[PDB]
């Protein structure tokens, strides 16, 4: 038999791929948020579209329906946990209200830049890829990691990194500098 493990596509490019306005806005999104691909925007678009579809299903359904109140409460709880919704944002028109910069803002590279751990989003991306961050004492190398609302206070540099002072990373080079200086002196 075949593996019963699932798999799913994360992206698509809408028809008219040379839509000028769409292209220019996406380029500005890449530039601003330190993305590597249009595919990064497309995954965020898929998440937003999933949100829009859910929100449409909820708002089309009436008040006092079991599916509607269960799914709506569950979605709002989850969106609050992800940190998409504000304090009094607890109604379906705010779920529709969500925008692509806000989803991008939940990314770890954006947060690392925001906290001032790195001096740029792209710098933050490389900092994260080079294994120097920790979230709640867990190292993560993923720049597209989406930070939960509770998690935001718990983001710092890895204690097992050279930045965390455990050892220099280039022991060889640091040793060479010490050895050469001691030999000459």
């Amino acid at each position: 038999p075949k593996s019963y493990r699932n798999y799913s596509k994360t992206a698509r490019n809408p028809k008219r791929p040379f839509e000028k306005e769409r292209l220019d806005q996406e380029l500005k999104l890449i530039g601003e948020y330190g993305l590597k691909n249009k595919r990064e925007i497309w995954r965020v678009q898929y998440l937003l579209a999933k949100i829009r579809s859910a929100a449409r299903y909820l708002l089309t359904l009436d008040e006092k329906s079991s599916k509607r109140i269960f799914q709506g409460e569950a979605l709002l709880r989850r969106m609050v946990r992800q940190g998409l919704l504000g304090e009094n944002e607890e109604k379906l028109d705010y779920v529709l209200g969500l925008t692509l910069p806000k989803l991008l803002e939940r990314r770890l590279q954006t947060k690392v830049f925001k906290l001032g751990l790195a001096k740029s989003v792209h710098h933050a991306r490389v900092l994260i890829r080079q294994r120097h961050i920790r979230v709640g004492k867990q190292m993560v190398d993923i720049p597209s990691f989406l930070v939960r609302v509770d998690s935001e206070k718990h983001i710092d540099f890895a204690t097992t990194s050279p930045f965390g002072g455990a050892r220099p990373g280039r022991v060889k080079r640091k040793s060479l500098k010490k050895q050469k200086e001691k030999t000459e002196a």
Partner: protein, 257 residues
Amino acid sequence: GKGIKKHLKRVNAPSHWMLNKMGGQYAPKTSSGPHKLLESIPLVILLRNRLKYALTFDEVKMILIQKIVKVDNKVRTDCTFPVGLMDVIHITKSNEYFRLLYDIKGRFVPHRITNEESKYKLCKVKKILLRKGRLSIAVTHDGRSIPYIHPDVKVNDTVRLDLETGKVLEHLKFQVGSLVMVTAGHSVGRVGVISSIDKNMGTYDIIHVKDSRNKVFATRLSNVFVIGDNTKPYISLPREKGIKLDIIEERRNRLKA
């Protein structure tokens, strides 16, 4: 050519079991015995997948080969032996007694039963036959013959039944106002009291059941099991007691703990 199919695949096997997708190619296929395939648990599932007293099928075999576990006062090493809807398992070595009950999530659960109260079970009859000499035998949900039963008892009655002597302690006439457990159908794994009986002619008999939240629903007669009386529940149910919370209520209740 053609004949008896001896295997049961993972996906094909009952959802009630909780046998996960990645966890194997097959499930155990039950031996013929106390209950129907869809309406039972084998000892392998009970020891490993419910109780978790063994890591593997081999560790289950190491438990079973020994004389330690006895069901119905009978020692069993038989891995795929089926234990049915309701009966008493005793594990001598750990000094443990379990009574089998339906969960509200429609799966079989082992509910801890008192050491004295392990003596008896409550047993539904499915049919009652007159054999040579006009001499009764009752036939039970758990596939047992109970010979020589008094004619007061009828074909849907439940009976409290000793396990040492195998015979009747008391009996409960099937009627409106009797506490009932649903064993199959839409309303599977819930308990209610019989609100009303209406005969259906030549076709499925339907029975109206009331919940303990004072809510009324229909169920087919074949798959309702009398389980107590309006005066008292006759056996030790788990804490949930077959009572239906809706998903929103249940998740809010879970959160508010």
